[PDB]
Amino acid sequence: AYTNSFTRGVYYPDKVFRSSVLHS
Amino acid sequence: FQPTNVGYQPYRVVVLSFELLHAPATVCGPKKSTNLVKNKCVNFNFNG
Numbered sequence: 001a002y003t004n005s006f007t008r009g010v011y012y013p014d015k016v017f018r019s020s021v022l023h024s
Numbered sequence: 025f026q027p028t029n030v031g032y033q034p035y036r037v038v039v040l041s042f043e044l045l046h047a048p049a050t051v052c053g054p055k056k057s058t059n060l061v062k063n064k065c066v067n068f069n070f071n072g
Contacts, residue, residue, distance in 0.1 A: 015046040
């Protein structure tokens with residue numbers, strides 16, 4: 001079978017704390 | 025390789041590759057640690 005992923009499966013790219021910010 | 029050979033002599037090699045990642049550090053230089061001092065202005069070195 002098959003299904004839509006939706007917006008799941010994001011992960012923290014590095015061991016650096018960041019907060020109240022948008023990072024690319 | 026024969027001992028009479030410089031460009032044709034055997035050279036032993038070691039290459040050290042260093043990871044400077046965001047992770048906790050794991051291999052350190054021999055620098056002696058010292059006590060933390062909060063609220064004062066300090067020169068500091070955490071893990072390098």
